[PDB]
PDB file of C-alpha atoms and ligand atoms in Angstrom:
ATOM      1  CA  UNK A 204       7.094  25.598  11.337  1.00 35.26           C
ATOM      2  CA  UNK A 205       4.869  23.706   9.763  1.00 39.47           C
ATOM      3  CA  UNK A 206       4.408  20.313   9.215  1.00 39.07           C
ATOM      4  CA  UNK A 207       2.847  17.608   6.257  1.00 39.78           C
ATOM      5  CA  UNK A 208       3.303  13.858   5.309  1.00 38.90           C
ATOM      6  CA  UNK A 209       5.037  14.086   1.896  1.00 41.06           C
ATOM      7  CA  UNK A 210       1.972  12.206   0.465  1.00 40.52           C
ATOM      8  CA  UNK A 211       0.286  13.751  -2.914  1.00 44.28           C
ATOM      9  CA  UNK A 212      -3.477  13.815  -0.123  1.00 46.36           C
ATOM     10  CA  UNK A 213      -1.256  14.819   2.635  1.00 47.47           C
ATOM     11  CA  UNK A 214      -2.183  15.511   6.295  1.00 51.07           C
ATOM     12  CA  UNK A 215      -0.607  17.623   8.601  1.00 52.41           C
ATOM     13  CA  UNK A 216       1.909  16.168  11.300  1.00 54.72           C
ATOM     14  CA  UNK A 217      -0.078  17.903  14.156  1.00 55.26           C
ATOM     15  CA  UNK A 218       1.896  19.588  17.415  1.00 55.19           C
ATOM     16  CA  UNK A 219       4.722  20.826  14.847  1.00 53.64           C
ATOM     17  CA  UNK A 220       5.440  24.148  15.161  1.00 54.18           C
ATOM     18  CA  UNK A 221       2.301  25.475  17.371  1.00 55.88           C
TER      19      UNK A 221
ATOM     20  CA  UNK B 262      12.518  14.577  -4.194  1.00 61.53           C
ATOM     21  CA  UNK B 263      13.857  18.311  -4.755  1.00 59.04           C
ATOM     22  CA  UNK B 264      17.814  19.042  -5.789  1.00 55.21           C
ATOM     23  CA  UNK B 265      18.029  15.843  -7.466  1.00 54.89           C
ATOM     24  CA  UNK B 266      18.733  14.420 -10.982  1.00 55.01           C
ATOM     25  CA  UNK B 267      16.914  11.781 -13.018  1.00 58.79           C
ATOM     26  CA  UNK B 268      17.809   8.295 -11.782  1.00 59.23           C
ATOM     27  CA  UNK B 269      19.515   5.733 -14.037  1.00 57.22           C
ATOM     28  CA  UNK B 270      16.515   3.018 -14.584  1.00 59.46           C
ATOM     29  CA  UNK B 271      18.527   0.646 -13.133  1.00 61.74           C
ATOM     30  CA  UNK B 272      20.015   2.397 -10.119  1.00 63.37           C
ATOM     31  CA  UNK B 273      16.336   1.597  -7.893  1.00 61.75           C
ATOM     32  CA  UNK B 274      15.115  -2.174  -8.442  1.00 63.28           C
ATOM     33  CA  UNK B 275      13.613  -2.338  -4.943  1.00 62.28           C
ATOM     34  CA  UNK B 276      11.511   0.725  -5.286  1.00 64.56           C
ATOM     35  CA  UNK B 277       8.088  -0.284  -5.727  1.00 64.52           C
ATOM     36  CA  UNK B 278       4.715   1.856  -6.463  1.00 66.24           C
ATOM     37  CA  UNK B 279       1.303   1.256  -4.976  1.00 65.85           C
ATOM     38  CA  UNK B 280      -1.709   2.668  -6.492  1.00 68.20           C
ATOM     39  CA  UNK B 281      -5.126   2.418  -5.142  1.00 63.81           C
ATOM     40  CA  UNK B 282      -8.806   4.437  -5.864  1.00 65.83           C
ATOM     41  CA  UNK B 283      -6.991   8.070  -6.139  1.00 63.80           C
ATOM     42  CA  UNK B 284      -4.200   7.609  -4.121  1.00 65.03           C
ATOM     43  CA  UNK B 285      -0.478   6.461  -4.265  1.00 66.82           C
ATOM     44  CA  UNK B 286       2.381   5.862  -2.198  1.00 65.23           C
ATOM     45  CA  UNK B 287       5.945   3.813  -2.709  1.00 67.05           C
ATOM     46  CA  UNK B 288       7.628   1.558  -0.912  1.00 67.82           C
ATOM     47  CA  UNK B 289      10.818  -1.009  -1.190  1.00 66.31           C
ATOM     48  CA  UNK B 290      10.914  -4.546  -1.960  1.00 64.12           C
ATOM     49  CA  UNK B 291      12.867  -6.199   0.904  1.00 62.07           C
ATOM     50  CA  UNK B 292      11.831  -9.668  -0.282  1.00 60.71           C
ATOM     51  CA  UNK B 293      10.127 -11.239  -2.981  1.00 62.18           C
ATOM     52  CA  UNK B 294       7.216 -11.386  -1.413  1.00 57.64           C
ATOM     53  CA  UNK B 295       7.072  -8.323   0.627  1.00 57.89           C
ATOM     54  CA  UNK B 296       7.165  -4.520   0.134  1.00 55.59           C
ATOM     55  CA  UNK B 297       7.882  -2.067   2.765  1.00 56.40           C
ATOM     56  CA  UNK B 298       6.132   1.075   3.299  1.00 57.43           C
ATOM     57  CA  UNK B 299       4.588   3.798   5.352  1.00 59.65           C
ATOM     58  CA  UNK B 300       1.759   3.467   7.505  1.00 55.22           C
ATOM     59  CA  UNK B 301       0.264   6.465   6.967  1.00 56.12           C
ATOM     60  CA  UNK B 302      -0.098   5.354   3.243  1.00 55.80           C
ATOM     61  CA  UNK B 303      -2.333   3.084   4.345  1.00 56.29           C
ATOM     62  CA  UNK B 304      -3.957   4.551   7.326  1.00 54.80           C
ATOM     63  CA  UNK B 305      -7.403   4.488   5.579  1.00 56.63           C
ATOM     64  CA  UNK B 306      -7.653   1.045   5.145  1.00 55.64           C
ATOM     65  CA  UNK B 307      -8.368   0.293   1.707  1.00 59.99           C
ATOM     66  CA  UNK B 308      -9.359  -3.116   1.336  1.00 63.77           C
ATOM     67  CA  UNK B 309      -6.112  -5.406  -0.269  1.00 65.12           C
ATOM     68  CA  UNK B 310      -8.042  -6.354  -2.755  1.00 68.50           C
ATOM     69  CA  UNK B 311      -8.364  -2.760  -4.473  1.00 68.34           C
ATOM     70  CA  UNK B 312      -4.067  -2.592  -3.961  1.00 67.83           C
ATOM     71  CA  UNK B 313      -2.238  -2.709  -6.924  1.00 69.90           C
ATOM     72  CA  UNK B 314       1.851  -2.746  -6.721  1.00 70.90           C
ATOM     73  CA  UNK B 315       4.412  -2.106  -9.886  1.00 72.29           C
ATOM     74  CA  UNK B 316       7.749  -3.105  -9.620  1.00 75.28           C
ATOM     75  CA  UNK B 317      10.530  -2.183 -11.931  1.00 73.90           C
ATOM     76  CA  UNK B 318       9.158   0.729 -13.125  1.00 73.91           C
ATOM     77  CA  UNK B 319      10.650   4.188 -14.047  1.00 75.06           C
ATOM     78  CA  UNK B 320       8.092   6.768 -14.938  1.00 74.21           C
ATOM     79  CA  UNK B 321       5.045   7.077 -12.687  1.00 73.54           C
ATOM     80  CA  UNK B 322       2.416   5.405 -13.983  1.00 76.66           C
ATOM     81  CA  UNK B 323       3.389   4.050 -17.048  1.00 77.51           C
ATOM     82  CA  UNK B 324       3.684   0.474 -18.437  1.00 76.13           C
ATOM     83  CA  UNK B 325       6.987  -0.904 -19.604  1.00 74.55           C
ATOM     84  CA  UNK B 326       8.759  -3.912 -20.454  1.00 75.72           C
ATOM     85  CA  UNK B 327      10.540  -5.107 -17.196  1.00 77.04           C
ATOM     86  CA  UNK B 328       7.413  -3.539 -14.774  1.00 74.89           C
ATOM     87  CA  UNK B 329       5.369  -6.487 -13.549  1.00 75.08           C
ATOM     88  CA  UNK B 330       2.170  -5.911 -11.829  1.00 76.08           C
ATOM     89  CA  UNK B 331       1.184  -7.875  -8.213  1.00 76.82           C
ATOM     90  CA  UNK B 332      -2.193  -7.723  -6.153  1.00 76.08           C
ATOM     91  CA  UNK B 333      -1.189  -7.403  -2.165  1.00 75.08           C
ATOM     92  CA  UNK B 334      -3.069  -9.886  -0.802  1.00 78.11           C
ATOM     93  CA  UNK B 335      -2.873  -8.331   3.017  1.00 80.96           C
ATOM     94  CA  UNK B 336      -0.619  -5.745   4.793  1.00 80.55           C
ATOM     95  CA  UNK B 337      -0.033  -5.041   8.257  1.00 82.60           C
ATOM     96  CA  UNK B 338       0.322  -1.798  10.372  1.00 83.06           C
ATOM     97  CA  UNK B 339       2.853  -1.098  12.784  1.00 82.16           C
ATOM     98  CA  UNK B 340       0.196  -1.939  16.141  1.00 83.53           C
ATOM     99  CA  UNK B 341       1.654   1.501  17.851  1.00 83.87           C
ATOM    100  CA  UNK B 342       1.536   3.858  14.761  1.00 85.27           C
ATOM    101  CA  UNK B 343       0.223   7.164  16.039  1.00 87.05           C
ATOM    102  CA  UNK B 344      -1.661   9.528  13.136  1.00 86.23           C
ATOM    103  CA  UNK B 345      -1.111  12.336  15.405  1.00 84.52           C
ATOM    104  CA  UNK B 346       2.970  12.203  16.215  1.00 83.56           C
ATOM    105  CA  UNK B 347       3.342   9.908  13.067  1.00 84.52           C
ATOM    106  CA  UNK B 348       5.757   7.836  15.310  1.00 83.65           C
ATOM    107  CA  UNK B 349       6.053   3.763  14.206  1.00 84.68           C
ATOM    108  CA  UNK B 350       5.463   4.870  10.654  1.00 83.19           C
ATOM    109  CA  UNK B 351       5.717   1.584   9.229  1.00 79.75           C
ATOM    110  CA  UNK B 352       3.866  -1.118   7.223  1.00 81.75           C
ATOM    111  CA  UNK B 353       4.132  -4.378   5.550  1.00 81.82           C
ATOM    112  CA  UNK B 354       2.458  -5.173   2.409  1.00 80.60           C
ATOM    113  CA  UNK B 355       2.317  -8.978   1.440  1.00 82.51           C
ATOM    114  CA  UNK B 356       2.077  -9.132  -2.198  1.00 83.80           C
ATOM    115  CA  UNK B 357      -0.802 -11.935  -3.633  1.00 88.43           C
ATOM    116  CA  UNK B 358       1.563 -14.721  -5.315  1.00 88.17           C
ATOM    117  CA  UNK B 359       0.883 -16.685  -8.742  1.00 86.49           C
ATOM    118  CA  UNK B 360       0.059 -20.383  -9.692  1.00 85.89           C
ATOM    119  CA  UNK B 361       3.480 -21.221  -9.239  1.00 84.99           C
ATOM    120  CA  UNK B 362       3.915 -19.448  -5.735  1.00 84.86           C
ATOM    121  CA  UNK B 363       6.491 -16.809  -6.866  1.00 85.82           C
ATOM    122  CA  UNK B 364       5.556 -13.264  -6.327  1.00 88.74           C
ATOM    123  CA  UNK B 365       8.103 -10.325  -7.576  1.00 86.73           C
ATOM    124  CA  UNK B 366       9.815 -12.495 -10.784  1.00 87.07           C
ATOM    125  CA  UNK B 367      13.393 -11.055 -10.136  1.00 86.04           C
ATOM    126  CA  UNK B 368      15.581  -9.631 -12.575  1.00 87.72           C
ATOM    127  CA  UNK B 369      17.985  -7.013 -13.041  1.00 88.82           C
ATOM    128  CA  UNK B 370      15.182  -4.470 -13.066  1.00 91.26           C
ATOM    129  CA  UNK B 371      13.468  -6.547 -10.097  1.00 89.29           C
ATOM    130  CA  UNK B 372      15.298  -7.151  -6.800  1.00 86.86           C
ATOM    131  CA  UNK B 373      14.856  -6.742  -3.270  1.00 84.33           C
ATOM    132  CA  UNK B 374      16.968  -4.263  -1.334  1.00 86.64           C
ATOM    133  CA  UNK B 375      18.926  -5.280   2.082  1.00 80.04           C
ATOM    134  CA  UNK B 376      17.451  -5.050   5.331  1.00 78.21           C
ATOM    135  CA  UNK B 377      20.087  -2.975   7.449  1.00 81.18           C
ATOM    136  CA  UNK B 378      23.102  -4.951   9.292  1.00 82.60           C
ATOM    137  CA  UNK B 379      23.282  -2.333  11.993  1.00 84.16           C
ATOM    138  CA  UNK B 380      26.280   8.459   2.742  1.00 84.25           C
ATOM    139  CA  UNK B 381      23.008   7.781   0.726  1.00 81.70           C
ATOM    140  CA  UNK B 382      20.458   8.165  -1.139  1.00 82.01           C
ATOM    141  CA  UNK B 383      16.719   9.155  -1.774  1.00 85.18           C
ATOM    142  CA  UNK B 384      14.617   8.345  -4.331  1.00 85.98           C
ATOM    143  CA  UNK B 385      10.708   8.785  -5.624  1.00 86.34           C
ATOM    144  CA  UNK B 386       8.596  10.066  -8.103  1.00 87.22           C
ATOM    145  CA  UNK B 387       6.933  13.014  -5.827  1.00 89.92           C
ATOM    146  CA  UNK B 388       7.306  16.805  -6.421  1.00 90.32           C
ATOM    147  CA  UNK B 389      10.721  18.102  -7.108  1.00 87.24           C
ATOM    148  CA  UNK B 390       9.923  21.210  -5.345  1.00 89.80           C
ATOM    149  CA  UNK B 391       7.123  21.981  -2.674  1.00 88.57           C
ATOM    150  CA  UNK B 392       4.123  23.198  -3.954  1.00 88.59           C
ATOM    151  CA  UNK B 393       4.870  21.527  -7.415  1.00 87.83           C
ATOM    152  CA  UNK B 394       1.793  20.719  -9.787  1.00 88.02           C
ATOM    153  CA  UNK B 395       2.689  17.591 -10.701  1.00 91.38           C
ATOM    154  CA  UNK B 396       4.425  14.433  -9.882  1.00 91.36           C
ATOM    155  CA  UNK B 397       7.800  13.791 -11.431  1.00 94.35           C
ATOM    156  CA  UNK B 398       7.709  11.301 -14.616  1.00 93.70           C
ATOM    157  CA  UNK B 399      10.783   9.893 -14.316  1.00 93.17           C
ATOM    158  CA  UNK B 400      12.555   8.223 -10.564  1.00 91.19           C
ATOM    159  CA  UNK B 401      14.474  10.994  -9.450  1.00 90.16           C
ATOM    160  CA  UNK B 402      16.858  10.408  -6.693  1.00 91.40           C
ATOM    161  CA  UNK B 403      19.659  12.697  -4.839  1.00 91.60           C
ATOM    162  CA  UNK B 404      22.481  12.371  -2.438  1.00 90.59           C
ATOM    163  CA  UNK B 405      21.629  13.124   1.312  1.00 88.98           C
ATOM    164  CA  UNK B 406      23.584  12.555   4.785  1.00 87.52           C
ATOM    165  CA  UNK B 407      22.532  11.077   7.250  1.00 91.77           C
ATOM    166  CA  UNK B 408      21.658  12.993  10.697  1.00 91.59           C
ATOM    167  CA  UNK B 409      22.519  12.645  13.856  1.00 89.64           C
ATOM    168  CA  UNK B 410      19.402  12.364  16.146  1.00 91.29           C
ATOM    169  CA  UNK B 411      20.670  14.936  19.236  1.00 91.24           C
ATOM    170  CA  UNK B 412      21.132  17.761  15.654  1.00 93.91           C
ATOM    171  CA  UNK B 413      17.912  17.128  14.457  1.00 90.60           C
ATOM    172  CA  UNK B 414      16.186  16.985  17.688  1.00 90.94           C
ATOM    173  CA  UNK B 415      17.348  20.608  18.429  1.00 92.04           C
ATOM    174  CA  UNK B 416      14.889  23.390  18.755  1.00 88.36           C
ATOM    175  CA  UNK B 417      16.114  25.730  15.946  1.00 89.11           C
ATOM    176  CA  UNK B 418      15.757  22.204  13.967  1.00 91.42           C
ATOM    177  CA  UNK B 419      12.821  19.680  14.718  1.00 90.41           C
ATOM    178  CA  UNK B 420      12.718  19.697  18.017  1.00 91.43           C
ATOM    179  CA  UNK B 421      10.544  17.428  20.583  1.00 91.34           C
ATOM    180  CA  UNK B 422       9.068  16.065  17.743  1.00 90.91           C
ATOM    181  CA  UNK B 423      11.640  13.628  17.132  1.00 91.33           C
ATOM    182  CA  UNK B 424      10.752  10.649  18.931  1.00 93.73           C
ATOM    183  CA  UNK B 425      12.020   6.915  19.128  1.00 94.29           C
ATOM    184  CA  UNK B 426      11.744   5.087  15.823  1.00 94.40           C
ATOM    185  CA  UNK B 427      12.447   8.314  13.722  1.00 90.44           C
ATOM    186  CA  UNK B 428      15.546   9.660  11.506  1.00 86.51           C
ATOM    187  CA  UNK B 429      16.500  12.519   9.802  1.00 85.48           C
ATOM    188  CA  UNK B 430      18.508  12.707   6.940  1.00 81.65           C
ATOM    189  CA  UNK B 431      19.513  16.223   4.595  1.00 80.22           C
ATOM    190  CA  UNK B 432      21.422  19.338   4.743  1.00 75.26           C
ATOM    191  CA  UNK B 433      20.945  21.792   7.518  1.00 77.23           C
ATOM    192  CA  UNK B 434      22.007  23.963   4.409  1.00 78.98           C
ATOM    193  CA  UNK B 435      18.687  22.832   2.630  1.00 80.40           C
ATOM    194  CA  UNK B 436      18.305  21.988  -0.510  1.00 82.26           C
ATOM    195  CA  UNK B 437      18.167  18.139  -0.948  1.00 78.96           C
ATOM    196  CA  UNK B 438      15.239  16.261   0.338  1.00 83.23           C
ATOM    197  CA  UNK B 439      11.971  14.505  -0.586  1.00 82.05           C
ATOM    198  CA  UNK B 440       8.385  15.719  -0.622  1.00 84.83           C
ATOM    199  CA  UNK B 441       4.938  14.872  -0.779  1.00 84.77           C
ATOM    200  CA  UNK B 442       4.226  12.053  -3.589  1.00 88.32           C
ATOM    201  CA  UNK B 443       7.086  10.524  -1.799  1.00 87.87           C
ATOM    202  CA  UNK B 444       5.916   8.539   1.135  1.00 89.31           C
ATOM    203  CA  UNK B 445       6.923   5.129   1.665  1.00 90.92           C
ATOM    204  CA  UNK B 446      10.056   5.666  -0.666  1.00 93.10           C
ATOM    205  CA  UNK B 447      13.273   4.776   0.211  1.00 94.29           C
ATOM    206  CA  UNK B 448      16.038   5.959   1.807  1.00 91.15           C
ATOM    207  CA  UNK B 449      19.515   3.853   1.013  1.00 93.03           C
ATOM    208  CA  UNK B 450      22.716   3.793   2.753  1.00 95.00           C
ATOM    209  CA  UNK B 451      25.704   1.898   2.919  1.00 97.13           C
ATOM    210  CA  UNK B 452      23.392  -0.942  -0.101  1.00 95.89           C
ATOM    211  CA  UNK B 453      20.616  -1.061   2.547  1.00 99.54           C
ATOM    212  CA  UNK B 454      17.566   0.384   3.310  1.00101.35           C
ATOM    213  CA  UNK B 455      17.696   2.535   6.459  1.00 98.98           C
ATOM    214  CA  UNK B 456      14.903   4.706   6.427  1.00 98.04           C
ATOM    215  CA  UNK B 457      11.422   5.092   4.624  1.00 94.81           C
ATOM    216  CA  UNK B 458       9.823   8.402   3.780  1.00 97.32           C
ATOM    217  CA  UNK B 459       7.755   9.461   6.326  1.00 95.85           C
ATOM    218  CA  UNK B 460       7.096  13.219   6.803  1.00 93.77           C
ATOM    219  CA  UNK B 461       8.925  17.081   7.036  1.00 93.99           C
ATOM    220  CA  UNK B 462       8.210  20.347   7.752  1.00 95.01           C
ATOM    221  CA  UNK B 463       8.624  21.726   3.792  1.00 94.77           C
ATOM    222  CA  UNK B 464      10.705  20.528   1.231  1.00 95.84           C
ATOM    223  CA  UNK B 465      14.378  21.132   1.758  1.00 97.08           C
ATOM    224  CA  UNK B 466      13.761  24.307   3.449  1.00 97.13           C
ATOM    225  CA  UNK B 467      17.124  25.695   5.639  1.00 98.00           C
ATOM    226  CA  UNK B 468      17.523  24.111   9.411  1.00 97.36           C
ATOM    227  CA  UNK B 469      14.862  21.365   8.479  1.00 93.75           C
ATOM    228  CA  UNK B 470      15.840  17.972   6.958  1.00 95.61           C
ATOM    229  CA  UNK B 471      13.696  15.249   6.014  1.00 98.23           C
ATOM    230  CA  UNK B 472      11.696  12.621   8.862  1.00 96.94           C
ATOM    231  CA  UNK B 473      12.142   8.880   7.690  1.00100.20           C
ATOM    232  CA  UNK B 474      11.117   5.990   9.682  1.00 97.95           C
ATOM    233  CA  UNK B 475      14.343   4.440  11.293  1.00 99.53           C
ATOM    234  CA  UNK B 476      14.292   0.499   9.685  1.00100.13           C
ATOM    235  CA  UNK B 477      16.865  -0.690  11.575  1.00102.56           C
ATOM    236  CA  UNK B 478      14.766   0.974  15.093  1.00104.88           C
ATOM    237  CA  UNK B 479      12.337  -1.983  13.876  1.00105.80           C
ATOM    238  CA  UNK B 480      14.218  -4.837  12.509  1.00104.24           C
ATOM    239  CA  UNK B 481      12.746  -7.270  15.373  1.00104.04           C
ATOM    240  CA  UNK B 482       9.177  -5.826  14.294  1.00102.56           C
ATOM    241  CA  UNK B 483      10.088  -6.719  10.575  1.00104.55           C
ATOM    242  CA  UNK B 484      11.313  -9.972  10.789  1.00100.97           C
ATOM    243  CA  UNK B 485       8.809 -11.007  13.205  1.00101.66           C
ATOM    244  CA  UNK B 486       5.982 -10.393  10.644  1.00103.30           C
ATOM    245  CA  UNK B 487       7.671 -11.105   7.393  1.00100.69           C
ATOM    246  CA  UNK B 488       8.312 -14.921   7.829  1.00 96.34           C
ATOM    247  CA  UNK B 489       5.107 -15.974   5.835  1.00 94.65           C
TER     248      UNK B 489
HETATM  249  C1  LIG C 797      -1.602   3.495 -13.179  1.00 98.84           C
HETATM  250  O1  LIG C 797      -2.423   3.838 -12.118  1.00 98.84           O
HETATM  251  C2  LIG C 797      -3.712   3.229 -12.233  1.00 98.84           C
HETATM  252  C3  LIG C 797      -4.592   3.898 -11.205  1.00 98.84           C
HETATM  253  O2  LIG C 797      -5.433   4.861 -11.825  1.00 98.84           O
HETATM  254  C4  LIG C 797      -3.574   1.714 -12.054  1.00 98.84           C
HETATM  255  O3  LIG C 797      -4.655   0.869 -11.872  1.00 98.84           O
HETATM  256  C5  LIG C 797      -5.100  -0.343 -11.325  1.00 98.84           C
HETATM  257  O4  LIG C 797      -5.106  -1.505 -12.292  1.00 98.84           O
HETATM  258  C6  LIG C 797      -5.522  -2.762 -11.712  1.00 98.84           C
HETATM  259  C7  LIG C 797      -5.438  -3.826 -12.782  1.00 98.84           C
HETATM  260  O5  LIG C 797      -4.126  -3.874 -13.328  1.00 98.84           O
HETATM  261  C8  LIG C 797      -6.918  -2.627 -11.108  1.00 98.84           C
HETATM  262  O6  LIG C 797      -7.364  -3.894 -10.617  1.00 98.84           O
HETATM  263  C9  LIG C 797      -6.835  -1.579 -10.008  1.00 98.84           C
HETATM  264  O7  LIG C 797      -8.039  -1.516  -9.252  1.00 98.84           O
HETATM  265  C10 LIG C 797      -6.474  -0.238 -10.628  1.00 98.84           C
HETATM  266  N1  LIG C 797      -6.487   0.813  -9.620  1.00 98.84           N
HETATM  267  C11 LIG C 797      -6.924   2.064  -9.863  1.00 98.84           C
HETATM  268  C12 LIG C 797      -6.860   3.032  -8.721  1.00 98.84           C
HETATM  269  O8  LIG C 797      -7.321   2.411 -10.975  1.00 98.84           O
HETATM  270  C13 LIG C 797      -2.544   1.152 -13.039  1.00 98.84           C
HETATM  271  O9  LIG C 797      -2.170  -0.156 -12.626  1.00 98.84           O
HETATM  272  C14 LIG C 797      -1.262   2.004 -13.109  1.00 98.84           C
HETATM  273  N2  LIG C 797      -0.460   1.636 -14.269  1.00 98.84           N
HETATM  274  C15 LIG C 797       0.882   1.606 -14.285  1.00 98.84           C
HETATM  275  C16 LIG C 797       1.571   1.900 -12.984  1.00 98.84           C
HETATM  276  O10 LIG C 797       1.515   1.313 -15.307  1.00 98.84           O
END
């Protein structure tokens, strides 16, 4: 899928899904 | 958090907000003078003395009687937090104390929440469905079980990137689960903290339940660098 770190600026958690 | 219902101002003493330049995150009081969070909250580095923490509050961001307001005076990140896998997603914030060398003034609206022994709940303020606007005003917080690591560490679920220190906790259903606005919140068991908001792959979506850090994982770490 794709990935983030619930955080209102929120950054992607990287090697998820791809 | 998404699928949840306002929270009973009461129900969450231990949550905690941090606000700082344009940013926010929460976190849990797990002693007077100490609030845990996520390290990628504070991966930046913002200098402690531009930290502001609010305990006993209920709607983001807004004054109220029992909310008392605390500098951090210093915080520590887990040494082996990784921005890239987002493993060792933890951090310590120690809260600047008064004259008379009490921090967090407790109270029924004020307390700190258990450290695990070794069903529950999740709480926060962040958006109650993904892609939401705006925060939520008042604490929501929603019933979510907890997940065993070999079912969340399948490949239709998260897969290899579960790694040690890490938890998952929601319905493989969907449905219930926290989002973004809600890093460093916590995540409450049986009542002890047992995980802290740490990342997903889309709110509540089917097949993919919520990422916390694992607390009890890093006990050792905690009390090691929380005497002081
Ligand atoms: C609401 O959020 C703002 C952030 O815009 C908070 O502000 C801080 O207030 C302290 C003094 O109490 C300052 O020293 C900080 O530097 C401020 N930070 C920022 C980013 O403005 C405010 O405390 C919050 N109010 C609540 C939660 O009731």
């Amino acid at each position: 899928x794709f990935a983030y770190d619930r955080r209102x600026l929120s950054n992607n958690x990287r090697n998820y899904x791809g | 958090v998404v699928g949840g219902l306002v929270a009973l101002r009461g129900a969450h003493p231990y949550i905690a907000a941090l606000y700082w330049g344009h940013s926010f995150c929460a976190g849990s009081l797990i002693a007077p003078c100490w609030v845990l969070t996520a390290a990628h909250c504070l991966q930046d580095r913002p200098a402690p003395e531009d930290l502001t923490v609010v305990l006993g509050q209920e709607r983001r961001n807004h004054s109220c009687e029992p909310c008392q307001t605390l500098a951090v005076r210093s915080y520590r990140l887990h040494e082996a937090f990784s921005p890239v896998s987002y493993q060792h997603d933890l951090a310590l914030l120690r809260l600047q104390e008064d004259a008379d060398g009490s921090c967090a003034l407790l109270s029924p609206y004020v307390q700190p929440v258990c450290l695990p022994s070794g069903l529950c709940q999740v709480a926060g303020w962040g958006h109650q469905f993904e892609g939401a606007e705006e925060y939520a005003s008042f604490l929501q917080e929603a019933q979510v079980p907890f997940l065993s690591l070999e079912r969340c560490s399948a490949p239709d679920v998260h897969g290899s990137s579960i790694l040690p220190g890490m938890l998952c906790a929601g319905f493989l259903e969907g449905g219930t689960d926290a989002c973004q606005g809600d890093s460093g919140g916590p995540l409450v068991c049986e009542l002890t903290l047992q995980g802290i908001i740490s990342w997903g792959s889309g709110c509540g979506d089917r097949n993919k339940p919520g990422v916390y850090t694992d607390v009890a994982y890093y006990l050792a770490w905690i009390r090691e660098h929380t005497v002081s």
